[PDB]
Write a protein that binds this DNA or RNA. Structure first.
Ligand SMILES: [K+]
Ligand SMILES: [Mg+2]
Ligand SMILES: [Mg+2]
Ligand SMILES: [Mg+2]
Ligand SMILES: [Mg+2]
Ligand SMILES: [Mg+2]
Ligand SMILES: [Mg+2]
Ligand SMILES: [Mg+2]
Ligand SMILES: [Mg+2]
Ligand SMILES: [Mg+2]
Ligand SMILES: [Mg+2]
Ligand SMILES: [Mg+2]
Ligand SMILES: [Mg+2]
Ligand SMILES: [Mg+2]
Ligand SMILES: [Mg+2]
Ligand SMILES: [Mg+2]
Ligand code: NA
Ligand code: NA
Ligand code: NA
Ligand SMILES: [Zn+2]
Lengths: 103, 118, 203, 123, 80, 50, 66
RNA sequence: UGCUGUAAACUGAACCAACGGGAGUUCCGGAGUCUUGUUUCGAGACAUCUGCCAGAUGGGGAGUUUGG
RNA sequence: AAUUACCGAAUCUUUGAACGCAAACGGCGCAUGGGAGAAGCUCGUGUCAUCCCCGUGCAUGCCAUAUUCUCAGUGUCGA
RNA sequence: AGACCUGAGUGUGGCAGGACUACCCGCCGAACUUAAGCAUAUUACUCAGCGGAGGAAAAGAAAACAACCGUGAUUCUCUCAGUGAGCGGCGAGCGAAGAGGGAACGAACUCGUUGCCGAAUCGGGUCUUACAAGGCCUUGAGUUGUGGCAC
RNA sequence: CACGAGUUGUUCGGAAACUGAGCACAACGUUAUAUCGUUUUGUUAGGAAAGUGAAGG
């Protein structure tokens, strides 16, 4: 006989994801010294919708720990996040919707 | 070598001796008084060429196919002591390149054509 | 001389000190490239007995190969024809790893001449050999009467034709007499001799 | 029409002036070739082309000989441009020279001097 | 249908001229010649077609330099 | 149409130059075998395709 | 002094040597691994010192093993 | 036990040393010192690890047959 | 000699292993040496910015080397 | 500061990649066909595929035959021999070696190791008509060993 | 069919000089065999891939 379709899909020829309109991987900040020993504050700039995904995405701006620059991240938004909100990440963070803290 | 302020090492700056100039690997004798004869081949004698000579102060030449307008102007001045104010060029469907050369109003294309022997 | 001490010492590869030294060297080697250039041989006695001299035209390289048997390169592991030609994993290559290492170095660096090689180290994944090569355009090499035979063009890629020691080993030329009649001067030569049909003129 | 014997007894400058004169004449003859033209005039095109070829041959031969004489000196013999070296063949250039081969060891020399090949007859 | 009508549906070009061998065999989309394998360093050569080998081998062209190197070899590289 | 490379234009120019008949004195030469061109091309019969 | 591996070994194997100095950082260590055992099998006093570069500087070469 | 800030709950700014001390112009502090050395974290002589042998299963696939 | 034959001296367009970078482009560079330039400048000359033309070098890898080139390492020492 | 070890950058001098591939050397490697079916076997250590040289290539100087009154590197020819060898669903089929008559033949040498010496060696400048197997000079390489002489 | 002619650009279309779905040179790895693989989800490569502003004396 001939090859089955579930095995054909493993070459990923015409069966790969359609990602031209996507905005990129959604991830938290890098676990670095400031997050391990203190907290960092960011501000939510915009909330957007990406093709192929059911949840919203948030653009959050921080300050670079070492250079004079601005760093923009892209996370998955929790329910209740709004633009202009302040987000805290690290050890000394308070407890609120959107804050990132250790378990 | 003492203190590094970047998170990765990059090749240092060293001394680079510049490349010497070799003896030339060409031995042929080339003459500087000859190139214009290669640039310009011969004129044209058709009815359109004659009409242009009589009306627009323009001469028509077959030129080297790889030459450009600046070279054609310089060669025109060297070969015949005239000044060209415009050169328009086309490559013919048989492969040759043809130029329309308009002389400045201080020169008569009819006189130049008579000197050439047209 | 000192050669006897080095030879007798390298004949004890399973002692504690030699095993320690080889373990350190193996760890170090498996974090390097596939081909590496050396300034001096790791086994000076072995290199000298194989033909290396501390002169201006000789070089040493260390090459790495992968251990284990050979897998037949057929799509999805499917063969056709008679069942006797249907193994995919149990077959073995008809040429040894020393010859494969020599051939890899020679294919990569075409301006040198491969002379010999010897065993250096071993692992569960890799084997390491060291290859001696000479430069045919060096004045020292060209004027030394003991090595300048290799400048002639009939010696251009010896390792690709099987004329090194390892090539001779896997060709069968370590034997003579009744153990080698069908493979001398080569298998193809013996086959032609035994199989061509002869027509004498006045038969 | 230029004669080779007379051409060979001239300097570079005179050769260049003659080259310019002949090129100008040929360029003039092309115009006749385009605008009608008589057979006697058209018969002059080939001799002029061959004269130009002769002048160029003499110029180039003189130049090459002078350059080889320049680089003959042992001080500069190692920087001779490869267009002035002897071509032969790739393999002949790369092969062992007669001096490089035909060397032997001290022992081989001594043995060959101690036991040379003899001439003899049998009665 | 698939006969006369579908020959009018063929627009375009799969191959163009090759810079190395001059044939109309250069694949525009793959950038590779179906006759000489350009831009690979070596050329296509297969023993299952000796007719093609004999069509392409040495001596089917001009022998521009071989003509004179053979004469030099035959005359022992004589010089004044 | 309008676009073509210069290399293609030069190939077409060479073909145009070649598409000519045999001159008449060739047939008067001694030992002559040529009568017609026999490599004539017509745009409507055979296509160059380049 | 006697310099070079072969000459030093011959001097040790006879009784000519009165003392031997051995460098401690030779690259293939098998070149000198056996030397103290041989000097101890004979009755030759020996020492192991810090640098083959320093030994070479002492004798006028780049390095020296013994 | 390495430490300078929880305005934020509806979006400010922040770099390319001030200053102090020494023997014009450099060097120290500001900006703690050290290194039996590992970039850091997690596992760890197990195995998510390498190769070689052995046994099961295996129309997913190959070859062949299906008397008179 | 527009005769023939042979050969030692030469010439040898664009490509191609093709190798400065590209290529359904007769395209575009960096270094260096030249040429032409009634722009301007100067006393018909000389000189010349921008633009234009020509020669030479410039791929990757490997070997040898530097009157002894410039460096890097919490590798081993020693000031 | 410096030295050694291990690595970089640039300058200077070189070399490889391609073509040809009848014969020759190395690997990889079928099926049709025969067996009056077919699977071991045969076709065949063949065709196709991937590498590499020359004017020939490869082989070659005994860890060889023999069992004699003994031969004596390699290659090739006749013969040994379609074999009272042997292999084989012991079927179809396959299948050599020693000896003997010859061709060729000035056919033989070199490292490592051992012993005695220990830079006597190599590269680079320069001078002898000379990019000398010569002299003079050079730390450049080399003592982690280049070179010489012998049982 | 024969002979002779015809295509003119500072600004129009392209290139010089953008990025896209994508390709695959180097580097590295693999293979008896490179004519194989990775090479844009910021993005080569166990990975030293930057060659010139301001300068002053
Ligand atoms: K590739
Ligand atoms: Mg135009
Ligand atoms: Mg041999
Ligand atoms: Mg035989
Ligand atoms: Mg369609
Ligand atoms: Mg089945
Ligand atoms: Mg190119
Ligand atoms: Mg080749
Ligand atoms: Mg058949
Ligand atoms: Mg059958
Ligand atoms: Mg049948
Ligand atoms: Mg059948
Ligand atoms: Mg074949
Ligand atoms: Mg041979
Ligand atoms: Mg020796
Ligand atoms: Mg018509
Ligand atoms: Na077309
Ligand atoms: Na058989
Ligand atoms: Na892209
Ligand atoms: Zn092609």
């Amino acid at each position: 006989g001939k090859t089955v379709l579930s095995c054909r899909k493993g070459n990923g020829s015409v069966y790969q994801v359609h990602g031209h309109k996507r905005l990129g991987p959604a991830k938290l900040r890098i676990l670095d010294y400031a997050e391990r020993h203190g907290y960092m504050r960011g501000v939510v700039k915009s909330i957007e919708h990406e093709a192929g995904r059911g949840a919203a995405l948030a653009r959050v701006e921080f300050r670079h720990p070492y250079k004079f620059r601005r760093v923009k991240e892209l996370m998955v938004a929790p329910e209740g996040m709004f633009t202009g909100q302040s987000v805290f990440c690290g050890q000394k963070a308070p407890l609120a919707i959107g804050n990132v803290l250790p378990l | 070598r003492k203190s590094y302020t970047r998170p990765q090492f990059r090749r240092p700056h060293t001394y680079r001796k510049p490349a010497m100039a070799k003896p030339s690997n060409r031995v042929t004798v080339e003459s500087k008084d000859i190139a214009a004869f290669n640039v310009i081949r011969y004129p044209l004698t058709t009815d359109k060429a004659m009409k242009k000579i009589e009306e627009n102060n323009t001469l028509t030449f077959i030129v080297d196919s790889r030459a450009n307008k600046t070279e054609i102007k310089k060669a025109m001045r060297k070969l015949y002591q005239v000044k060209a104010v415009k050169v328009n060029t086309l490559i013919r469907p048989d492969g040759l390149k043809k130029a329309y050369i308009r002389l400045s109003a201080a020169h008569d294309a009819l006189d130049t054509a008579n000197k050439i022997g047209l | 001389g000192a050669f006897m001490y080095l030879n007798e010492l390298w004949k004890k590869k399973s002692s504690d000190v030699m095993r320690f030294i080889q373990r350190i060297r193996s760890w170090e080697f498996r974090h390097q490239h596939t081909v590496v250039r050396l300034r001096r041989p790791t086994r000076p006695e072995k290199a000298r007995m194989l033909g290396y001299k501390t002169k201006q035209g000789f070089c040493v390289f260390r090459v790495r190969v992968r251990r284990g048997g050979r897998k037949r390169p057929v799509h999805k592991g499917i063969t056709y024809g008679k069942p006797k030609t249907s193994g995919v994993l149990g077959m073995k290559l008809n040429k040894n790893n020393q010859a494969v290492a020599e051939q890899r170095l020679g294919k990569r660096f075409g301006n040198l001449r491969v002379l010999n090689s010897y065993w250096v180290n071993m692992d569960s994944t890799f084997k390491w050999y060291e290859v001696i090569a000479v430069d045919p355009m060096c004045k020292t090499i060209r004027r030394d009467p003991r090595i300048n035979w290799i400048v002639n063009s009939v010696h251009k890629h010896r390792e690709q034709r099987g004329l090194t020691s390892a090539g001779r080993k896997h060709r069968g030329l370590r034997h003579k007499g009744h153990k080698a009649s069908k493979l001398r001067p080569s298998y193809r030569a013996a086959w032609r001799r035994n199989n061509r049909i002869v027509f004498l003129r006045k038969r | 029409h230029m004669k080779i014997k007379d051409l060979r007894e001239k300097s570079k400058d005179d050769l260049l002036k003659t080259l310019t004169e002949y090129k100008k004449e040929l360029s003039q003859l092309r115009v006749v070739q385009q605008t009608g033209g008589a057979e006697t005039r058209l018969g002059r095109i080939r001799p002029i082309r061959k004269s130009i070829a002769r002048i160029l041959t003499v110029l180039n031969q003189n130049e090459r000989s002078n350059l080889k004489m320049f680089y003959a000196d042992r001080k500069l013999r190692c920087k001779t441009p490869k267009v002035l070296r002897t071509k032969l063949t790739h393999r002949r250039r790369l092969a062992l020279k007669e001096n490089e081969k035909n060397r032997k060891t001290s022992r081989q020399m001594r043995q060959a001097h101690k036991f040379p090949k003899r001439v003899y007859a049998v009665k | 249908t698939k006969g006369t009508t579908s020959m009018g549906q063929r627009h375009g070009r799969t191959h163009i001229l090759c810079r190395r061998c001059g044939r109309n065999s250069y694949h525009v989309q793959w950038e590779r010649c179906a006759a000489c394998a350009y831009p690979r360093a070596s050329r296509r050569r297969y023993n299952w077609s000796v007719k093609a080998i004999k069509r392409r081998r040495t001596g089917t062209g001009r022998c521009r330099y071989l003509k004179v190197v053979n004469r030099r070899i035959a005359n022992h590289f004589k010089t004044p | 149409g309008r676009f073509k490379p210069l290399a293609v234009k030069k190939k077409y120019a060479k073909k145009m130059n070649q598409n000519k008949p045999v001159p008449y004195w060739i047939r008067l030469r001694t030992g002559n075998r040529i009568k017609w061109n026999e490599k004539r091309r017509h745009w409507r019969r055979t296509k160059l395709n380049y | 002094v006697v310099t070079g591996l072969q000459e030093v070994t011959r001097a040790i194997e006879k009784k000519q040597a009165r003392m031997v100095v051995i460098a401690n950082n030779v690259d293939p260590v098998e070149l000198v691994l056996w030397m103290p055992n041989l000097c101890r099998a004979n009755k030759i006093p020996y020492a192991i010192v810090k640098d083959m570069a320093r030994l070479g500087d002492a004798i006028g070469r780049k390095t020296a093993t013994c």
